Amino acid sequence: ADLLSKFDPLIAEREALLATGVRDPYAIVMDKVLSPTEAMINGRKTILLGTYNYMGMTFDPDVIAAGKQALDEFGSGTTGSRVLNGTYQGHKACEDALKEFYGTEHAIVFSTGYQANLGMISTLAGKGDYIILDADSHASIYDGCWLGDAEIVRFRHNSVEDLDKRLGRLPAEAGKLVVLEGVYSMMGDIAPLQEMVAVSKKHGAMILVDEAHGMGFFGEHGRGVFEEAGVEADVDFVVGTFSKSVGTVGGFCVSNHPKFEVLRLVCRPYVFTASLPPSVVATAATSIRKLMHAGDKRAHLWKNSRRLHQGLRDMGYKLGTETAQSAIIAVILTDMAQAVALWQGLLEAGLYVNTARPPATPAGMFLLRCSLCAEHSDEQVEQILGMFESAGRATGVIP
Amino acid sequence: ADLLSKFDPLIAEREALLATGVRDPYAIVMDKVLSPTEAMINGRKTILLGTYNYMGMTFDPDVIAAGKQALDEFGSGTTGSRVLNGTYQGHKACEDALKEFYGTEHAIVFSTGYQANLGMISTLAGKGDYIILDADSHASIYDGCWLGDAEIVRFRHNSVEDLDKRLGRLPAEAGKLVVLEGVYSMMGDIAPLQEMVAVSKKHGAMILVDEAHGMGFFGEHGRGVFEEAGVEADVDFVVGTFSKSVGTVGGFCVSNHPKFEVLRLVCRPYVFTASLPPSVVATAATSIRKLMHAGDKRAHLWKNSRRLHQGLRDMGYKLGTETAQSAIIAVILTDMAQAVALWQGLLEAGLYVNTARPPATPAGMFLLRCSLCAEHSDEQVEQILGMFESAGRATGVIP
Numbered sequence: 001a002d003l004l005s006k007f008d009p010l011i012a013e014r015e016a017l018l019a020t021g022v023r024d025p026y027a028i029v030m031d032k033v034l035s036p037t038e039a040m041i042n043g044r045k046t047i048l049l050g051t052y053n054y055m056g057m058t059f060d061p062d063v064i065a066a067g068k069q070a071l072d073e074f075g076s077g078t079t080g081s082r083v084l085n086g087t088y089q090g091h092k093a094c095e096d097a098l099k100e101f102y103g104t105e106h107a108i109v110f111s112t113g114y115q116a117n118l119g120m121i122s123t124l125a126g127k128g129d130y131i132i133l134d135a136d137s138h139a140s141i142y143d144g145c146w147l148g149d150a151e152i153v154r155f156r157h158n159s160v161e162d163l164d165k166r167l168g169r170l171p172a173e174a175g176k177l178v179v180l181e182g183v184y185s186m187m188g189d190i191a192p193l194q195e196m197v198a199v200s201k202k203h204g205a206m207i208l209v210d211e212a213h214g215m216g217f218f219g220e221h222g223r224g225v226f227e228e229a230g231v232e233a234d235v236d237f238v239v240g241t242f243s244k245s246v247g248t249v250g251g252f253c254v255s256n257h258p259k260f261e262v263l264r265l266v267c268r269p270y271v272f273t274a275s276l277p278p279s280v281v282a283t284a285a286t287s288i289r290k291l292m293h294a295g296d297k298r299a300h301l302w303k304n305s306r307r308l309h310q311g312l313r314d315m316g317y318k319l320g321t322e323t324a325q326s327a328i329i330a331v332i333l334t335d336m337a338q339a340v341a342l343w344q345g346l347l348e349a350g351l352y353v354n355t356a357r358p359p360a361t362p363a364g365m366f367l368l369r370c371s372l373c374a375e376h377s378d379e380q381v382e383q384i385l386g387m388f389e390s391a392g393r394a395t396g397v398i399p
Numbered sequence: 400a401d402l403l404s405k406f407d408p409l410i411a412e413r414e415a416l417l418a419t420g421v422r423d424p425y426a427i428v429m430d431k432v433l434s435p436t437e438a439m440i441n442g443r444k445t446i447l448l449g450t451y452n453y454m455g456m457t458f459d460p461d462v463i464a465a466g467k468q469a470l471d472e473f474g475s476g477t478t479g480s481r482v483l484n485g486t487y488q489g490h491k492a493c494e495d496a497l498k499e500f501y502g503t504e505h506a507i508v509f510s511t512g513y514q515a516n517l518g519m520i521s522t523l524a525g526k527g528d529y530i531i532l533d534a535d536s537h538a539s540i541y542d543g544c545w546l547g548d549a550e551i552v553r554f555r556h557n558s559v560e561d562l563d564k565r566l567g568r569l570p571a572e573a574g575k576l577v578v579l580e581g582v583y584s585m586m587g588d589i590a591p592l593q594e595m596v597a598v599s600k601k602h603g604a605m606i607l608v609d610e611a612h613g614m615g616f617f618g619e620h621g622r623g624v625f626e627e628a629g630v631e632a633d634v635d636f637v638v639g640t641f642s643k644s645v646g647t648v649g650g651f652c653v654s655n656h657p658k659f660e661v662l663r664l665v666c667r668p669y670v671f672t673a674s675l676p677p678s679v680v681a682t683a684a685t686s687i688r689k690l691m692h693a694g695d696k697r698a699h700l701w702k703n704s705r706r707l708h709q710g711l712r713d714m715g716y717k718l719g720t721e722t723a724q725s726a727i728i729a730v731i732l733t734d735m736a737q738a739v740a741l742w743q744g745l746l747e748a749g750l751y752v753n754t755a756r757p758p759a760t761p762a763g764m765f766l767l768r769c770s771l772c773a774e775h776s777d778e779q780v781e782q783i784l785g786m787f788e789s790a791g792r793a794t795g796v797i798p
């Protein structure tokens with residue numbers, strides 16, 4: 001027995017699943033990517049409906065040109081931390097792009113969204129402080145909590161009432177950080193941030209909101225659900241990513257707090273990692289600036305999401321939301337065998353979607369998760385619906 | 400008072416330092432980068448001697464061509480996790496390049512070296528396990544310990560004797576992970592891995608070694624200090640980075656353990672972050688493959704380090720090592736004012752080096768840290784020495 005022995009049940013469970021010949025969801029390789037919406041998987045041309053490329057920026061000609069030029073002018077990488085030799089003009093320019101996008105006085109870029117959450121949460125709340133978060137918060141937010149030394153307070157998923165109740169029992173003078181997400185990624189529903197922010201401010205909490213899943217398509221300027229909800233002035237910190245709407249890699253946190261820049265000196269997941277390559281901050285900056293004016297993509301993203309949502313429910317699928325609340329649509333299934341047959345059937349017909357399973361989902365609930373892209377054409381959305389209809393009938397999920 | 404108030408002493412301490420008019424080491428921006436060894440900083444053409452671009456790969460024409468082509472063929476980013484839609488042919492090819500470089504059966508690429516340590520350490524050792532590490536281990540290794548739920552055992556810096564003593568008191572049946580680094584980055588001295596690995600195996604510990612600071616220039620194949628030390632067959636896991644010798648961004652862990660691939664399913668800093676952009680895995684793969692045959696760069700790196708080390712000690716500087724043990728050379732100073740005057744003097748003369756300060760260093764010790772590059776010419780090393788001589792005399796550090 002050694003340190004990997006604790007994974008023996010999982011390995012055994014996996015080998016037994018694979019022994020039945022079913023397709024492995026952990027072995028999908030994009031051999032070739034034709035566009036933001038199509039890739040070759042195992043020799044088959046496949047519509048991608050399981051990416052977070054919400055605004056189709058990954059093949060934007062300006063983004064790509066910026067990346068190439070940065071490689072020529074600045075090289076493949078910085079070979080240093082932001083706090084030593086790794087801050088190039090591109091890193092500062094990218095932070096300026098974020099300040100303009102969010103209308104904030106400060107922007108700190110991290111090397112991943114994971115690190116942004118891990119760092120912000122583990123640095124802001126220390127011994128004697130409390131972190132109050134939704135039970136179903138993203139793993140990176142939890143990892144922030146677990147890395148730090150604060151007291152953790154979980155409130156029932158999506159319950160303003162429970163948040164308020166839980167905050168009220170906490171000691172008056174303890175520091176409190178409420179961490180919220182704009183869009184809950186599992187089911188693609190949105191948080192009631194207006195109500196939750198008001199409850200949080202009433203108890204004197206500082207508020208950090210993750211807006212990774214609404215960038216470019218919620219709020220007047222595309223800043224996220226918090227802007228749409230009208231609580232921009234009451235949110236202390238907004239964390240996001242470069243790996244979804246922006247279409248590259250990286251994380252960030254924006255804020256108007258006058259002491260915010262001090263985090264560059266103390267935030268360990270910022271300090272003790274290399275800064276991003278010049279090509280990454282160039283592509284990110286160019287993408288971010290275009291996202292400020294991407295009204296056409298935004299409008300088409302919403303059209304796509306509403307069409308797919310309405311179409312799926314109309315043919316008999318049960319969805320995680322009564323209406324399209326975001327660009328994520330969750331199809332709910334009650335049988336594991338049925339869930340795998342449908343997913344595999346879709347894949348073999350040329351459609352890729354994501355899946356979710358217990359214990360990530362609650363017991364007895366199996367999800368197919370669809371995420372729309374601004375670059376899905378009207379015609380592709382109709383094809384997608386046709387594929388769901390065909391595969392759904394073949395597997396007995398719908399009549 | 401709020402969650403940032405705890406940083407008020409640091410902010411005040413910083414404003415008081417800056418009030419004296421001294422140059423800010425946390426405000427260096429590379430406005431333009433001319434080559435691996437030169438950049439424009441605040442309008443001045445400056446030789447870079449504070450990067451971890453050890454093998455000068457950042458401007459390699461093949462690396463750069465691979466990056467550009469990947470942008471064209473695969474776009475600016477993957478917009479998904481490795482375990483969903485984010486595994487492209489480039490990610491698999493990059494892992495194959497690592498397998499070839501290290502001669503291992505497995506390679507897992509992470510989005511940063513920070514995440515590779517954080518993930519490996521927090522996942523391998525759980526409740527009832529022990530992590531045994533050098534007191535002066537890298538912050539990312541510590542963060543791995545703090546994120547996880549294992550018992551932590553610090554041994555005195557660089558003490559084989561203390562490691563052995565500490566391991567012997569641990570419960571016989573508890574899982575044990577010894578985490579070691581090949582090169583200690585502060586002073587640039589190397590760990591006695593032959594002795595430490597033997598002590599670790601004698602107690603039945605699994606061994607993870609970080610080889611971020613020797614890649615391409617220690618060991619027959621450039622695999623690191625552990626290969627040089629002859630203990631390749633006894634090390635279970637090797638963690639490294641793409642951000643130093645490789646010249647991009649990313650992390651990895653390589654291993655021959657037959658259950659190693661299971662970590663892709665459970666390692667949270669792998670699962671819950673986007674995979675790297677196609678350009679990053681393309682440049683990394685191309686760089687890694689060239690590093691396998693980079694004898695010329697390696698030989699010149701060592702020549703540079705030995706010349707600089709000998710030259711600095713010969714003119715009167717006190718160094719962290721009696722001989723050049725790596726590509727890092729630490730100049731030891733005993734007065735903060737003198738340390739800042741020398742660093743600033745070098746910078747204003749056109750030389751950039753890194754600095755270290757308490758509490759990163761021990762009380763009363765102030766360092767200038769030089770890191771050689773394979774692309775520093777013989778002539779630049781002579782210029783560098785001339786600059787150290789001039790600035791050193793002006794500041795009274797040397798006669």
Ligand SMILES: *Cc1c(COP(=O)(O)O)cnc(C)c1O
Pocket residue numbers: 112113114115117138140141181185210212213241242243249250251671672673674
């Ligand atoms: C996607 C996401 C992350 C991770 O972002 P990466 O940049 O891919 O590491 C973190 N938090 C939330 C809420 C996310 O949605």
Ligand SMILES: *Cc1c(COP(=O)(O)O)cnc(C)c1O
Pocket residue numbers: 272273274275511512513514516537539540580584609611612640641642648649650
């Ligand atoms: C540089 C380094 C890291 C961090 O690597 P990044 O890829 O820059 O995050 C982690 N551990 C050690 C020992 C390092 O030297």
